[PDB]
């Protein structure tokens, strides 16, 4: 019993970061192989930050100008290309602690561990989602950036997210390991911001049958609801449309708990009408909404990972 | 900016844990230099739940009955002893992966990460607080028994809890990595419960200084209040009494702030008597006891581990 916010373990990314330096700048990189990625913008000084033209900044550049730091041990770059928004140092030496690995860009409302570090060393590990408009809640400060997100499935390290920016209202913008932004963010200096964000509908229901797995059922009700007019009270509230994709992916939950997924919409429907009442569920006062249906079967099931 | 509920690095346990087995009974055990420590009940079959008598029940046990095994390689048992309610398995290697560690016994209030495992395979990262009654709200299932908690220093991991037992209540019990239990909880049979728990006072003032820091000052006020007046208000509300001893650790977190701590208490007592109102404090619409003054410190400054 019981329900947290578990984060995947994090050995094999820990065994993966370093330190990258230029000039001034240092952040973390993903040592893979014989590559290191990490954002490109550690060929930025200070003013070239306006609208700084990488592909001249990093023509100027030469591989001794890159410090690489594994930790005691420096690496040597022999080669670099830039991809996106990510720079690829090729160095001398392989990662011999290389995990299986795959690079995934997410969709938004999928969740994720991020371990956060400075100076190429980790300082600890969250879960988060990708929100609907292509933030994600983080906790970073500076030097974070080159921290990477991921999943683990059975053996394999999905890596989805490298960090590179903070938002005016706090939040956190990034990219996939091939560099390619999450949202309409950029890594240059303008007045980006964050859009307005909705609630992950699917991954409330997700939840909602979490709760009753573990023994809550204060918030269900004898109502059904269909699709159509779940969706009309959804968007009042500001969360997502439900699909019927949504609602195929919760088939294994309703299947476990016996509650319909259409039933569970009615308990939402009437939990955003009325409210909590005072009460909680799983220890929250609030609606949850970063627990995928996947994350619930995981942890009420007990999945490992080789 | 941000804040989240964060666990240390996991990966340093990770290359610790191993699963034990004893006839039908199979749990983790954690494998540092040439010992396995494990729950002891792992030698218990069904029958020997009532009131066991271990000394008995291991004498009448041989080394070749402990099956060890260590991913894919099975470990050979070669001596064992009974230290209260763990037993440490000798076995022919050490492992190779132990880092710096310590065992640790931790004081109700402290906050640790635990890495649940199964079959002695990893399955996830979680932080958790030890509750004023010596219980935990972890997330853990069949199987799971075994499983550490601990907290990272530098590069020095200190063990403090082993899992053993669910509570009725869905919360959970365990020891020490000396086999002392939190609690008066034991491993028998009998109709043990939870005691009625209260909420940390220093780590729910810890919260609101981590949420002054991210830029959010709504519940501030004018005033300040005695210790004694503070507690007669905790105490009405099931608080822990606040002592001096929790007010002088406070105090980085009151200087980086600039908030007296007995005026944070005022903040505190008003939002006992008054509620929140409909906002929400770092994300929560509850007031949040399981970080540690330490955690906040770590968390904003960005603290690393070698
Ligand atoms: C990351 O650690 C990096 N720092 C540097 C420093 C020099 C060169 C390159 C990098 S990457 C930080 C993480 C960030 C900082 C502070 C708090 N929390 C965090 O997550 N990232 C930045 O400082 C980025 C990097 C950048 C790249 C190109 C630019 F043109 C400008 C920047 C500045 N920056 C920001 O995150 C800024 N935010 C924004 O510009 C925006 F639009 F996203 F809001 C800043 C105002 C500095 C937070
Ligand atoms: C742990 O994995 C172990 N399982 C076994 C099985 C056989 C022998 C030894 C062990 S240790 C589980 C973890 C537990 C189970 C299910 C859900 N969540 C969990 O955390 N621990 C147990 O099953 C313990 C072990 C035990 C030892 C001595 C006993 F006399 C009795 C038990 C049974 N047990 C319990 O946790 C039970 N709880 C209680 O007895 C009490 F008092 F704590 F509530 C149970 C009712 C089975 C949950
Ligand atoms: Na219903
Ligand atoms: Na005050």
Not at 93 to 115: D, H
Not at 158 to 183: I, K, Q, R, W
Not at 207 to 236: C, E, P, Q, S
């Amino acid at each position: 019993s019981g329900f947290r916010k578990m984060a995947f373990p994090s050995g094999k990314v820990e065994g993966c970061m370093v330190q990258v330096t230029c000039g001034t700048t240092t952040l973390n990189g993903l040592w893979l192989d014989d590559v290191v990625y990490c954002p490109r913008h550690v060929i930025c000084t200070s003013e070239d930050m306006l609208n700084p033209n990488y592909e001249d900044l990093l023509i100027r550049k030469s591989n001794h100008n890159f410090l690489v730091q594994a930790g005691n041990v420096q690496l040597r770059v022999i080669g670099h290309s830039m991809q996106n928004c990510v720079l690829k140092l090729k160095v001398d030496t392989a990662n011999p602690k290389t995990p299986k690995y795959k690079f995934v860009r997410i969709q938004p409302g999928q969740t994720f561990s991020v371990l956060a570090c400075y100076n190429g060393s980790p300082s600890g590990v969250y879960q988060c989602a990708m929100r609907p408009n292509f933030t994600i809640k983080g906790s970073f400060l500076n030097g974070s950036c080159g921290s990477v997100g991921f999943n683990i499935d059975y053996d394999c390290v999905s890596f989805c997210y490298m960090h590179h920016m903070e938002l005016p209202t706090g939040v956190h913008a990034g990219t996939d390991l091939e560099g390619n932004f999450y949202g309409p963010f950029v890594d240059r200096q303008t007045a980006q911001a964050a859009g307005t964000d909705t609630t992950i509908t699917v991954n409330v229901l997700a939840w909602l049958y979490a709760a009753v797995i573990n023994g809550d059922r204060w918030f269900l009700n004898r109502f059904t609801t269909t699709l159509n007019d779940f969706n009309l009270v959804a968007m009042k509230y500001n969360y997502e449309p439900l699909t019927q994709d949504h609602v195929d992916i919760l088939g294994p939950l309703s299947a476990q708990t016996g509650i319909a997924v259409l039933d569970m919409c009615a308990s939402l429907k009437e939990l955003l009408q009325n409210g909590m009442n005072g009460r909680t569920i799983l220890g929250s006062a609030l609606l949850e909404d970063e627990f995928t249906p996947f994350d619930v079967v995981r942890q009420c099931s007990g999945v490992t990972f080789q």
